[PDB]
Design a protein around this ligand. Structure first.
Ligand SMILES: [Ca+2]
Lengths: 254, 61
């Protein structure tokens, strides 16, 4: 996260840290005791899925305070429409091998119903994005969890406020822009898969997933996030299904 | 004052959480798992220790 602040320990309880062979891979969002939502591209170059670990209750990577809870990842479900190496349909649903225990430092973010998210949450100006990603473009990653408040924009406004690149991916109906174009605040590499949380009447909901963007905090550019509302039904159906052999699972979408 | 409103699209139908429209001048509010709907028909109250979307350290101030 660039231009943000440290998320006070426990104020980002749904934040998940994904590790591969002990190394930081991506962020994620706990939505219940055994399910985590992340970004599909996070698993583009995974060799052995048996080395994927999800950590809840994490805050400071330099120490262990006992609030951390680690779980193996039993399943990584990606939409059939996602194509490795691209940006569209950047979402993944992870099933933990064992549920985490809810505590003051480990709490799920609410996955909203489609209607509510499209006709209410989508209209909430600011939302929080968080992660242990790079603090600066081409810079080192954060040791403490960082958080940033970013304003959401209409896809039409985004395109009309962003500098054309041509080779740059297009903004589909499965994504949305959020952030600033003055190159001051934005999510960055390492934050991918993390939550874009929206508050409404005292409760927080998952509205987006850190997906991509031109560099980090690049002037004339906004961060791009996966529009979670388009996958509510897809996610709910999968969470009611039985686990299947093999970690990786491509599921039809819609 | 707190109730009223039918169209869920307008001000969330007055619901604190989820809203559903019914045939005619009807509206039903609902709450996420771990919450119950109050008698006002719009408010949601936690029914568990750790409901989703709530920050414990802040709820306890
Ligand atoms: Ca720690």
């Amino acid at each position: 996260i660039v231009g943000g602040k440290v998320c006070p320990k426990g104020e980002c309880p749904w934040q998940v840290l994904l590790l591969v062979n002990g190394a930081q891979l991506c962020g994620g969002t706990l939505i219940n005791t055994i399910w985590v939502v992340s970004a599909a591209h996070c698993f583009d170059k995974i060799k052995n899925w048996r080395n994927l670990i999800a950590v809840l209750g994490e805050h400071d990577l330099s120490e262990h305070d006992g609030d951390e809870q680690s779980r193996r990842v039993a399943q990584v479900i990606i939409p059939s429409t996602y194509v490795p190496g691209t940006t569209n349909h950047d979402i993944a649903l992870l099933r933990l091998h064992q549920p985490v225990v809810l505590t003051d430092h480990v709490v799920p973010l609410c996955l909203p119903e489609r209607t509510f998210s499209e006709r209410t949450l989508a209209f909430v100006r600011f939302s929080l994005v968080s992660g242990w990603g790079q603090l600066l473009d081409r810079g080192a990653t954060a040791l403490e969890l960082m958080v940033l408040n970013v304003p959401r924009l209409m896809t039409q406004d985004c395109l009309q406020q962003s500098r054309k690149v041509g080779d740059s991916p297009n903004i589909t109906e499965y994504m949305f822009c959020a952030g600033y174009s003055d190159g001051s605040k934005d999510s960055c590499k390492g934050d991918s898969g993390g939550p874009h949380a929206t508050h409404y009447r005292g409760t927080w909901y998952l509205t987006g997933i850190v997906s991509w963007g031109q560099g980090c905090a690049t002037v004339g550019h906004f961060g791009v996030y996966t529009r979670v509302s388009q996958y509510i039904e897809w996610l709910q159906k999968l969470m009611r299904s039985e686990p299947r052999p093999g970690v990786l699972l491509r599921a039809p979408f819609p | 004052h707190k109730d009223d409103q039918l169209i869920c699209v307008n001000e969330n139908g007055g619901c604190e959480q989820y809203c559903s429209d019914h045939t005619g001048t009807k509206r039903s509010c609902r709450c996420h798992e771990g919450y119950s709907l109050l008698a006002d028909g719009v408010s949601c109250t936690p029914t568990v220790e750790y409901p989703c979307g709530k920050i414990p350290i802040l709820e306890k101030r």
